[PDB]
């Protein structure tokens, strides 16, 4: 549930 | 080629950050065609400019609290969330960054973003205030300092850093490489593979040194002066976290946005 991972994978 | 790397970083910098230092300086010096920003210097001028501060939530910014300091707190963390997103987009354009282990990419962002934020705040500051809402408004240093404790203690060390940092007279081409150097710090806690990170920062540092010699041939040892600012930013972060903890221990309804909570959780 990492929001930073979501921004990095976009 | 170090000049090609510098130009690539600058191009990504222009794409990722809507309000550059060049655009900010044109606003701060009034040498621009658009109208002057709304100036917030006291309670009345804040109430008149409050709805022009970018803030998208359940209720308008003016309804966040009866206290002026808390409304400033809420509006600032809305900006911070978007600032982290801009810095993340720029970080992904740094050659080699997205090839690193994803967990190391997270770590470099977790520890780097606020150091980048405070670096780029200086671009939006003069000795008397800071531009807000993409240059649409201007909030004075005296007003931010007049807020009740601990709210009045947040911005003042950032202004103090900015006065000294702006004396270096860097431009956007310099800053693009400098912030990339900061993101690619091999000594961040919990990094899995330090070597490939240091390999990238080595090239970034060489590109930075060449950039400063070409763009500032009169500023001898500008490279050495700038490197010392990288450690100042870590002190600012340490002081900032302590103020946020005073908020968490002594204030009630206040809660950081989810993205900010993730960054600060288990930080150092
Ligand atoms: C000052 N300014 C420009 C953006 O300045 C930044 C100054 C600092 C930051 C970093 C960010 N800060 C906060 C996060 C949550 C709540 C408050 C703060 C403050 O730092 C703060 C506290 C009290 C008073 C003023 C600020 C962080 O830690 O993530 C991000 C942006 C504002 C202010 C209000 C609304 C919009 N534009």
What are the residue ranges spanned by the domains of chain B? Answer: 1-268
Q: In sequence order, what DSSP letters do the residues of B99-164 get, joined into one string?
A: TS-HHHHHHHHHHHHHHHHHHHHHHTEETTEEEETTTTEEEEHHHHHTSPTTGGGSSHHHHHHHHH
B226-257 CB burial, b ≥16 within 10 A, e <16 = beebeebbeebbeebeeebeebeeeeeeeebb
- Give the span between the Cα atoms of B266 and B268, in whole angstroms: 6
> Which of B130, B133, B163 lies closest to B145, judged by CA?
B130
Sheet with B137-140, side-by-side order of all strands:
B38-40, B137-140, B129-132, B125-126
Return all residues near B92 (Cβ < 8 A) that are at least 6 apart: A8, B98
- Give the span between the Cα atoms of B136 and B83, in whole angstroms: 16
> Which of B104, B257, B95, B79 lies closest to B190, judged by CA?
B104
Ligand 1 atom showing the smallest separation from residue B80 Cα: 30
- Give the span between the Cα atoms of B108 and B228, in whole angstroms: 19
- Give the span between the Cα atoms of B190 and B59, in whole angstroms: 39
- B261 and chain A in contact, CB less than 8 A: no
The rounded Å distance from CA B193 to ligand 1 centre is 32
Instruction: Give the pairing of strands B38-40 and B129-132.
Output: unpaired
Residue B240 assigned as binding residue: yes
Contact call for B92 and A4, based on CB within 8 A = no
- B98 and chain A in contact, CB less than 8 A: yes
Angle between helices B21-28 and B102-123 (to 10 degrees): 20
Residue B55 assigned as binding residue: no
- B110 and chain A in contact, CB less than 8 A: yes
Ligand 1 pocket, CB under 6 A: B 53, 72-73, 75-77, 79-80, 83, 114, 117, 121, 130, 132, 139, 144, 151, 154-155, 240, 256, 260
What six digits make up the tokens of B7? Answer: 């130009």
Query: How was this structure obtained?
Result: X-ray
Note if the bond before B126 is cis, omega within 30 degrees: no
Chain B residues within 8 A of A3 when measuring between CB atoms: 258-259, 262
- Of B88, B258, B263, nearest to A8 by CB-CB distance is B88
Pocket test for ligand 1, best of B38, B39, B75, B76 (most atoms within 8 A of CB): B76
């Amino acid at each position: 549930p990492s929001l930073l991972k979501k921004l990095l994978l976009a | 080629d170090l000049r090609a790397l510098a130009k690539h970083l600058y191009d990504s910098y222009i794409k990722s950050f809507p309000l550059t230092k060049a655009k900010a300086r044109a606003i701060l010096t009034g040498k621009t065609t658009d109208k002057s920003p709304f100036v917030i210097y006291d309670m009345n001028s804040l109430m008149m400019g409050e709805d022009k501060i970018k803030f998208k939530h359940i209720t308008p910014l003016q309804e966040q609290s009866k206290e002026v300091a808390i409304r400033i707190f809420q509006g600032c963390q809305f900006r911070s969330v978007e600032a982290v997103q801009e810095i993340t987009e720029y970080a992904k354009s740094i050659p080699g960054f997205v090839n690193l282990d994803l967990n190391d990419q997270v770590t470099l962002l977790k520890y780097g973003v606020h150091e980048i934020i405070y670096t780029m705040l200086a671009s939006l500051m003069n000795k008397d205030g800071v531009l807000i809402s993409e240059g649409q408004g201007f909030m004075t240093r005296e007003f931010l300092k007049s807020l009740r404790k601990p709210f009045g203690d947040f911005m003042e060390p950032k202004f103090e850093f900015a006065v000294k940092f702006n004396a270096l007279e860097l431009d956007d081409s310099d800053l693009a490489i400098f912030i990339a150097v900061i993101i690619l710090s091999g000594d961040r806690p919990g990094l899995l593979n330090v070597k490939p990170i240091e390999d990238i920062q080595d090239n970034l540092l060489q590109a930075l040194e060449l950039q400063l010699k070409l763009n500032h041939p009169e500023s001898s040892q500008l490279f050495a002066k700038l490197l010392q600012k990288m450690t100042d930013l870590r002190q600012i972060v340490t002081e900032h976290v302590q103020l946020l903890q005073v908020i968490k221990k002594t204030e009630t309804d206040m809660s950081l946005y989810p993205l900010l909570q993730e960054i600060y959780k288990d930080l150092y």
